[PDB]
Ligand binder design. Sequence first.
Ligand SMILES: *[C@H](O)[C@H](C[C@@H]1CCNC1=O)NC(=O)[C@H](CC(C)C)NC(=O)OCc1ccccc1
Ligand SMILES: *[C@H](O)[C@H](C[C@@H]1CCNC1=O)NC(=O)[C@H](CC(C)C)NC(=O)OCc1ccccc1
Lengths: 299, 301
Amino acid sequence: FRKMAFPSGKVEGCMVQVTCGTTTLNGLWLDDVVYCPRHVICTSEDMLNPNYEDLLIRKSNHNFLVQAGNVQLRVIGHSMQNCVLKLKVDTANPKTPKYKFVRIQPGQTFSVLACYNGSPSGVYQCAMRPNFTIKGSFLNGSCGSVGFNIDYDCVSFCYMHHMELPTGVHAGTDLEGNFYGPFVDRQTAQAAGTDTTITVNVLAWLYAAVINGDRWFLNRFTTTLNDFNLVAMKYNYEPLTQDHVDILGPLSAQTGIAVLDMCASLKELLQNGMNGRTILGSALLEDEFTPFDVVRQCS
Amino acid sequence: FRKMAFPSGKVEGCMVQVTCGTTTLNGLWLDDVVYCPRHVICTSEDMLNPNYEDLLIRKSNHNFLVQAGNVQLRVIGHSMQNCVLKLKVDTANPKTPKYKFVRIQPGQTFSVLACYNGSPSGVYQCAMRPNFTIKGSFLNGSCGSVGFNIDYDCVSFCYMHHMELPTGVHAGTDLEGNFYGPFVDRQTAQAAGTDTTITVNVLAWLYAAVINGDRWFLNRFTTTLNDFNLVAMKYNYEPLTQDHVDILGPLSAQTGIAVLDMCASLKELLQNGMNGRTILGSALLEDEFTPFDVVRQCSGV
Ligand SMILES: *[C@H](O)[C@H](C[C@@H]1CCNC1=O)NC(=O)[C@H](CC(C)C)NC(=O)OCc1ccccc1
Ligand SMILES: *[C@H](O)[C@H](C[C@@H]1CCNC1=O)NC(=O)[C@H](CC(C)C)NC(=O)OCc1ccccc1
């Protein structure tokens, strides 16, 4: 049982490099449009406090240098949608997959294809934290890298990278240009809300540990849904809903452990700690596997 | 600090399915050759105790179904090389990347593209353990999935998947069909040797901590390589090779911390524990990041 990302080939064929003056970042080329973060139009001084509409009206098509590998693509239009710039190009990307733009909810997961200068560097799995940050691995020049899920050949784009907070976590937008969370695309120190742990994910991962022959944390105690949620909230865990309990149904049926029995197990785990033991090789309770992630990997 | 796979697109374009009778696994299509585990030619019952030379005698080119998606590739020749089958097909794969076949050492990492029915399913980072197993995530029908590194557009294939051991770890071959470790492709009870911690990777991880400012564990001592190796073995840590000292060179230069000084720091951690302190926010010493993985992630490679 490992943190597993989607194969990135369908997205790799869409990455390009976008340059305006001195600033370089990545763009997503679908059909005849290139999507990228709007702060590519900023100089260093601009970034500190930009007025984007005012900055954008002063740009021409030829201020945008888009490169797909060695080939320049000619920009023939441009518009702005929220924090995302849409560059109309004179060539259609032949490698455009079947795709959709989706806005994901907190606790959901996706794969990130980290890119620099329009070239893919690495792929890894992330979750949208409840405070709408993501614990990523991004360096300078990674903006415009996207997050995605893949279902039967259709790529669901859910994230585009824009920045790193002073705490080292990351913030971005959906493909419509709207930030996840209370962040803005300005070069200013920004704090996130207090993060919480994704409870339904922790339970899914505890079920993964059982499917893989680890049971040390189980007990014979029981709990009601409301009594578990009281303890969970006390420990900065998100509430468990009945929808979550249902979503865990297959994992419960597979292992024969009722959801509320696994809740009792996690409650003890939260109140006693792990006593220096590990679960699936982890000294901490892991919350970036969804129930579907566990099912996909285990079955 | 997270495990990051290589982008998998160059390998995805090479995955096909190979069927004999009812047995289907994955194959690797490079130029006009398809590489796959030789037990594709086994029936359910023949896997218990297979005679591969005799099983292959009864096979002809026309007994092999090679498909890229639903499109059949005609097999025009077959041979066995160690535990892999090489199927000559009549079409050169137009998506063949620049590539090499390499045999990796214990402790080296690679990305695995897990495939089923020749269809890629996920990608994750693995390390070759010192007992020559990998802690993989594989299901029925994953055999023939490959593990690989990429350097400057050249894909180095290092692993092809063949089996699961009773402890739940996995075993396989290089792309010349030579098993890593002392395993055989027979459905027999086999057991991985006792595992050990990958010292060179723990050291890499200590350097990564130092690069990020977490350096409380740096002590005022040093040690010789031989003295360190003798103590490390007492803690179930691998001995260091001369090549291990050399691949730590770049991190040693970047931090100004001598490799043998860092060794003496790790020794103190082994003899006294961490005293309830963390390193990169972990209470456990991590051993599946190589020196290259640390560099690759701190740079924009
Ligand atoms: C895009 O390549 C870049 C990604 C950052 C670079 C460092 N790690 C990343 O993920 N984005 C920015 O540099 C971004 C641009 C703004 C105009 C949105 N700025 C940023 O991330 O700095 C945030 C920050 C500002 C001031 C203090 C502390 C952090
Ligand atoms: C090839 O797809 C398969 C991979 C196994 C399937 C379960 N998880 C895996 O990694 N390899 C075999 O089935 C292999 C074939 C022999 C000729 C080497 N046998 C094997 O792995 O035996 C152990 C085992 C078999 C079936 C389920 C679980 C373990």
